[model samples]
Target: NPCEKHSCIAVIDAGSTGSRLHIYSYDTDDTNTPIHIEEIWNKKIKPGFASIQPNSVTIDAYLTMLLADAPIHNIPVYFYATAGMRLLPQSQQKKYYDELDYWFRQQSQWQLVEAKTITGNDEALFDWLAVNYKLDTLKSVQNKSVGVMDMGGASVQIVFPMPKNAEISKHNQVELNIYGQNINLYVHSFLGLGQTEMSHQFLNSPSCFANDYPLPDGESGQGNAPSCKEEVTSLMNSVHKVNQQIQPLLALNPVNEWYSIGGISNLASSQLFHFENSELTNQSLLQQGDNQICHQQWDILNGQYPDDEYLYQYCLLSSYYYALMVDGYGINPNQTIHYIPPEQNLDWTIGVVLHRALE
Candidate 1:
């Protein structure tokens, strides 16, 4: 029963920004616990599968390339589509999944688990599970677990532990069974609050930045950080208000436009009111010194960097992040936020794989 004793799983994360393939292997150790679970290989293709819908050929080729060096036969393969596909019409979404299934069925190397769009709640919970597992907090004291806050292009997710005695709301409260223990988690995703969405919504407004910015198209707009903060605060207030129920937001530093533009340390300082109002004045000035240093370092290293067309958007994005943490979620700015280290993958595919393997 060697084949039954060992399992390999492949997961395709079709995200808003890109699609990634993760190949994992798992085996039970002497203790009969699932051990030796490792990510064997992973590959990513940009622009996401959503951008090229009805074009299954490209996706198929990408998948084929990913399996080139690994065993494909009988391996369970899953394609989990996220926010990008969730935005599509139901008919279109079905068509895309159907095409993917058809393509996979034609191959004898892999078994398709499921190809579908997962909900925002699903996204938050998976991430929460992964973060807690990574931090080794899953088997800790009954109610102690690390929280997770993920901000992407189209949405933001917040998941945290609730007190054992806390009243349970049916909608956002989730029960998770990990390592033979039951855990209660409060999870929610704020749609249209992502950096990209916020940027699009506030592009024409003068309150989002300090200077005018050129858009991808042949258009431009002005920025006003103070004004932008006001609008972002109002937007956050409309959906949900921050309180002690959820605090100490974790895992804020990931690959995103907002996090990249606003330095984690600076954002934390601003949140705690460590800087004077005048010091935080304009977005353009706030990032000028850092930008210059970055440019100089790149030049010295002969490295090429992307053009800064959206330079003015930093202030607005930063302001929005700060407001979201302080005004929206009631997170303490002075408290430190934890992030996934550079060596680890921040994607939720690992979490999904762990859940499936254990089940």
Candidate 2:
């Protein structure tokens, strides 16, 4: 199976905008770096807020299009529904579910299995894992500790995983005893606060969103919008509120490594604290392209290249293909190909892991 290459696994990442289908080649070997990612199909659907709900006719129609595309060839596919699917009216949600179930049977002659949705807790785990691995790769992880603050389109999640050796109580409650590995997670999935809300909040703030604040006239820099600071502070306050709620579950142990994840945290986390700029200069597999990413920003190296034209499609495909390699299929490192790493030819071991993981 090491050398075997399977038909591309397509991923459907449904979000507020529409849906995206990503096709990827799966290699069983784990050692290969820079896994190959191909954009098989990218098509935008309707608003989907109410009319074409997630997993509904709107979704099935898109998938059907791909299945019918001769190049697609009925390859194995995975569909993951995000915020839109979760927030839609129950009746609408069910409509999509029924439609999806029917499509699976008719198109592929396979049962349409409802992929288990990730709960707040599960989302926290994946982000936490990314953080843990990042810190570990940087040689900063101690006591297996990692922390993540993920801000999504509609919500935020903050979580810290318990140490591997920790004991669980009868209620399955954990004391979070281990250091380094004991992650501190904080998630806040707010109803508002994506680009539009954040922009509005910043513009409406008292400081008029001035870029210069606190710093002297010449010393102060441009682009440091005071309003942005307030908005971020307010958001952080919301996070702190959640932290207070879970304070009992968070026992402060010696943390050898502390990091942040999620889109918003990647932007606001380090700025919240005054860590030295030099100290904050760690490189991340994710957040590399945009300089907006900070030191605390660390994301797994997605092996595939991101589609320049369509961002949602790029993210969905990269994420799904990573999942396919790591979860859907098992990976073996030796047979993998690459240009960087512990294995010099691999582009990046993390990228290699992403590809091989899908195998």
Candidate 3:
């Protein structure tokens, strides 16, 4: 009855940190585009899909844990892998998909649509759509421009409004017709600039850690936010050329406000820090990390904020965020960036529903 009343689709976000399954039911509008979509069932599990062994038995068990408890049975499903799978070579990526394809064929409840690693460009489109959909900005044309940034563990993406430029490569842009409006956007993702990936090489950087924090190199941390930012700037500016890639474009098409999704939301929402209006500026973020976490004694900080698991890395995270946005993207430190409250647990899957070709 539910299937006939409203079409349902299941999307699995196989992320670097974990996998999340989202099932949505929606009705069609006059144009037959999906509308009134609602999340009916959802499930998430630890360890990313790419991190697991891809044999039949393991794949079956992993699939079972994700799909067994669903309230509904029959639905079309999409398994989309993000940055984690992108990090793998095609040979390794194929092995996982091979097992997944076989497993889905064995199941009757969820009809497999497609399962493949998505490009960051595609992810950016969904990121923009999902955020704007939540912000109620997608229903109609807006007076102000809204931009989106997704800070994942393996990649970070930035997308903002821009008219199609003849000089810009076609792959870096996306044009979509949604809600009777034509939208053009510029999208780019830095592969190794994610917090987790970038942190790998910076682990021994003393300025990035809390004062007296133990490093893997047997060195005591002497946390300095400014110094840490400069170190990160080299990676963003010199190595990645993030400034060259993003700054000029952003300078031409400035965003009024930024909406971010991913790690920064969790950090800003954490009890260890305080932010107003679900928004914070780069300046305030850096100041708090420097004064509260970076300067604090490691043992005392650990004792005081035992519950905050990410407390130790706040200094690095803050410094990197600042460098990435200010130095790399050339955004002003005083610019206000809004974040969706972390409790929503929302991701880009909803955009798939809105953008779904549900015939």
Candidate 4:
């Protein structure tokens, strides 16, 4: 057994839409793997005002509410800010940060902690880790070259590693390629095409959708009339544009396997879960609601919802599982909690736990 630790780590993924807290139990085996192992605890939440307008009053109220809902267990907490916070004006950001810290100190009796803000480069690295370790696209990546196409709710990042001879993992580095010969592959981050943005963009573009019939305006993954092909095409076009921009790199290494992540990616495979069948799927009540509504209202209505056939045809988690492998977690990414292997357990995986404990 690995030399496990009792520390807990909590991750607050402050995204364009909202903020979430994922607390984890940590463990470590003295090996090539990282020191912290993670298992999720209760997930808490707050609003993501930064997504709409930086430091909005809603966000402040949400943070205060989160503090009130702080976990009963007293373990170390680590907080992180993402896209929404990064986009805020420095003055506004500082103002929000101050309030966040002060509120936690006063109400929770626990100091609010901050972690390294993830830069576009850092976000790319996380995507790379998910692709290589978590997604497991390449069988043996020790000296091999690989590529990643990670689409977030608010952004899309394309990553390629530096040369093999060059130290990739030095000073918080993760390499995607070796051999400093050519541009080989370049990393790209596209800022404007997240699901929500794209949905809005699609609805607003007069020329794109027909004039007689306007693009539906509920959610991207819901409602009919909106074409999934159009959604996928829009995203693909963006990817293609980036590929064209990095044509030089494509000329050199050529992308092997393209992997995806984030909300849309998660929506890519929704057929497996019966939403109503709790016995077969152990997703939370909220998730069940999502599945039910998504399936009924959006599945067929949203031109792009995957069907049962699609789910069975493509080993859905191929790239997602590969991401986990890249992260050195041996669990099968495809299995839902209800169907988890007898030998494999959630406690053994690495995720929010590492961030929580070490931070």
Per-prediction TM-score = 0.74, 0.49, 0.96, 0.57
Query: Which predicted model would earn the best TM-score?
Result: 3
lDDT of 3: 0.88
Candidate 4 regions with alpha-carbon error over 4 angstroms: 1-5, 29-36, 42-46, 51-61, 67-72, 107-111, 115-117, 135-144, 164-186, 205-241, 271-359
Better of 1 and 4 by TM-score: 1
Query: What is candidate 4's local distance difference test score?
Result: 0.42
What is candidate 1's TM-score against the reference?
Answer: 0.74
In candidate 1, residue 100 scores what lDDT?
A: 79
Model 4 lDDT tens row, 243-294: 3444444445444334444532343335433433211221232233333332
**Highest lDDT scorer:** 3
Ranking by lDDT: 3, 1, 4, 2
Predicted structure 2, TM vs. truth: 0.49
Residue pairs of candidate 1 with colliding backbone atoms: 72-109, 207-224, 207-228, 209-223, 209-224, 242-328, 242-329
lDDT of 3 by residue, 1-359 (tens): 46668888998999998899998888877766677888888898978999999798998888888887788878889898999999999999999999999998986778999999998988888889899988888868887889999988889999999998999988889888888888899999988898889999899999999989999999988899889999999999999999999999988998988999998999898876799999999999999888887888899989988878778888999999999989999989999989888998668898888775321
Q: Which stretches in model 2 have alpha-carbon errors above 4 Å?
A: 1-10, 22-57, 64-75, 109-111, 115-117, 130-142, 163-203, 206-224, 231-240, 246-255, 258-359
lDDT of each: 0.59, 0.36, 0.88, 0.42
lDDT of 4 at 139: 30
User: Which is better, 2 or 3, measured by TM-score?
Assistant: 3
Clashes of each: 7, 45, 0, 26
